[PDB]
Amino acid sequence: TATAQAMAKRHATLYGDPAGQSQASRIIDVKPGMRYVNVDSGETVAFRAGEKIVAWTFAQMVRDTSVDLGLLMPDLPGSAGVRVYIDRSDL
Amino acid sequence: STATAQAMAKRHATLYGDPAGQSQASRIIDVKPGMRYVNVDSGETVAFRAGEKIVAWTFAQMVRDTSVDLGLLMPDLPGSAGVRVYIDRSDLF
């Protein structure tokens, strides 16, 4: 389990890095049934569920990619099942 | 005054896509006080909600990344003005 959490954190690294919420350019409220969000390569986004806030800087992706928000932030309530579509990098 | 403006706003909005029905939208975006932007794809059909009012839009196929104010796309959705929609470039070019 601790090992499964380590595995998930390693996989999550493909998609970017944790960031300070002070660094975010927007805060998205994670709501039941929201389905998905769209983010840009390199964008820093804070995700909020009540008083819990977790932020993330998306990596420069080689192609359009998507990922479950629950992989990036398992501790954020309501994150599982919300799809994150990350736009390919301009670079 | 008030009126002519309405008409030129609809004209501006037309460059960015077409009114859509909620039944064709792939997601519903909550429009809340303080919201500043959202990201949509060229060709995406998105519904925007204020309380229980829902207005949907199908974004045009854009030659480059561009933005438009939601308040110009849907003046009758309360709180839409000031929310900027970032539209990703179309893959069709």
Ligand SMILES: [Cl-]
């Ligand atoms: Cl979004």
Ligand SMILES: [Cl-]
């Ligand atoms: Cl927090």
Ligand SMILES: [Cl-]
């Ligand atoms: Cl990278």
Ligand SMILES: [Cl-]
């Ligand atoms: Cl987390």
Ligand SMILES: [Cl-]
């Ligand atoms: Cl969850």
Ligand SMILES: [Cl-]
């Ligand atoms: Cl939705």
Ligand SMILES: [Cl-]
């Ligand atoms: Cl405001």
Ligand SMILES: [Cl-]
């Ligand atoms: Cl609302």
Ligand SMILES: [Cl-]
């Ligand atoms: Cl505009």
Ligand SMILES: [Cl-]
């Ligand atoms: Cl409207």
Ligand SMILES: [Mg+2]
């Ligand atoms: Mg794209």
